[PDB]
């Protein structure tokens, strides 16, 4: 094959370390660090308004339009040295309103019929996310209960920032990604468990 290598953090301290060493070289304004901190205590509220009005902020309250602009700005400084793999956790409503109450049997195991409906609906296709993408350097335990697990592959030089410390209200080994990002679902298979779906997306960029 003609496949490229991505660094996957196999240990928490190794991630925490590489992580903090990237926080240094960013040099974020005081203004942004509070936009990122407010973003971690409101990630739900903001991304919701972002997926909604499909990227338009010229209707958002003043407070917001500014924060949104500040978050975007911050990414001019937060890129990644080399190719990396990030981990995200999602609930069924992520795949669609139809998988909401169809994806998992009351046994907790994944329904192989709904799984195929999804595999056909997304495999080898590009998805577009309107809000920001919170992720982790590893499959931390704040996912693991979540039925869907995406594994992003981010290319050298792409916007990605280790905001773990910048906000105390940032998840474990948290790594933010720019809004409006577009990735390509390259693989879907069930965990060697029975309950999950292990997606393998390939990021491309943000427009
Ligand atoms: Hg990381």
- Return the CATH number at 44: 3.90.176.10
Cα angle value 192/194/197 (rounded, 5°):
80
What's the CA-to-centroid distance between 137 and ligand 1, angstroms? 4
- The catalytically annotated residue of 32, 167, 174, 179 is 174
- The catalytically annotated residue of 32, 74, 88, 179 is 88
CA–CA distance, 194 with 145 (Å, rounded to integer): 13
Helix (H) or strand (E) holding 200: strand 197-206
Pairing of strands 174-176, 135-136: antiparallel
Provide Rg for the chain, Cα atoms.
Answer: 17
Experimentally, the structure was elucidated by X-ray
- The resolution, in Å, is 2.7
CA–CA distance, 58 with 19 (Å, rounded to integer): 34
Phi then psi dihedrals of residue 90, to 5 deg = -135, 155
Structure tokens at 131: 């809000």
Pairing of strands 148-154, 84-90: antiparallel
CA–CA distance, 55 with 193 (Å, rounded to integer): 37
Give the chain's domain count.
1
CA–CA distance, 163 with 40 (Å, rounded to integer): 10
| 201: nearest Cα among 72, 52, 95 | 95
- Residue 34 designated active-site: no
Report the residue count for the chain.
207
- Residue 134 designated active-site: yes
CA–CA distance, 99 with 93 (Å, rounded to integer): 6
What's the distance, CA 192 to chain centroid? 23
CA–CA distance, 75 with 174 (Å, rounded to integer): 15
If you ran DSSP here, which 8-state letter would residue 78 be given? Answer: -
Per the structure, the complete domain to which residue 62 belongs is given by: 1-207
């Amino acid at each position: 094959a003609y496949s490229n290598t991505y660094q996957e953090f196999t240990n928490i301290d190794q991630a925490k370390a590489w992580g903090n060493a990237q926080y240094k070289k960013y040099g974020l304004s005081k203004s942004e660090k509070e936009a990122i901190v407010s973003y971690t205590k409101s990630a739900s509220e903001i991304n919701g308004k972002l997926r909604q009005n499909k990227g338009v902020i010229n209707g958002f309250p003043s407070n917001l339009i500014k924060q949104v602009e500040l978050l975007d700005k911050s990414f001019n400084k937060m890129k990644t040295p080399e190719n990396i793999m990030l981990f995200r956790g999602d609930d069924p409503a992520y795949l669609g309103t139809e998988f909401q109450n169809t994806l998992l049997n009351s046994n907790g195991t994944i329904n192989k019929t709904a799984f195929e409906k999804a595999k056909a609906k997304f495999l080898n296709k590009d998805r577009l996310e309107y809000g920001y993408i919170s992720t982790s350097c590893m499959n931390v335990s704040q996912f693991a209960g979540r039925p869907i697990i995406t594994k992003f592959k981010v290319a050298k030089g792409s916007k990605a920032g280790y905001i773990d410390p910048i906000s105390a209200f940032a998840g474990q080994l948290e790594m933010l990604l720019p809004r409006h990002s577009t990735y390509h679902i390259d693989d879907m298979r069930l965990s060697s468990d029975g309950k999950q779906i292990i997606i393998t997306a390939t990021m491309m960029g943000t427009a």
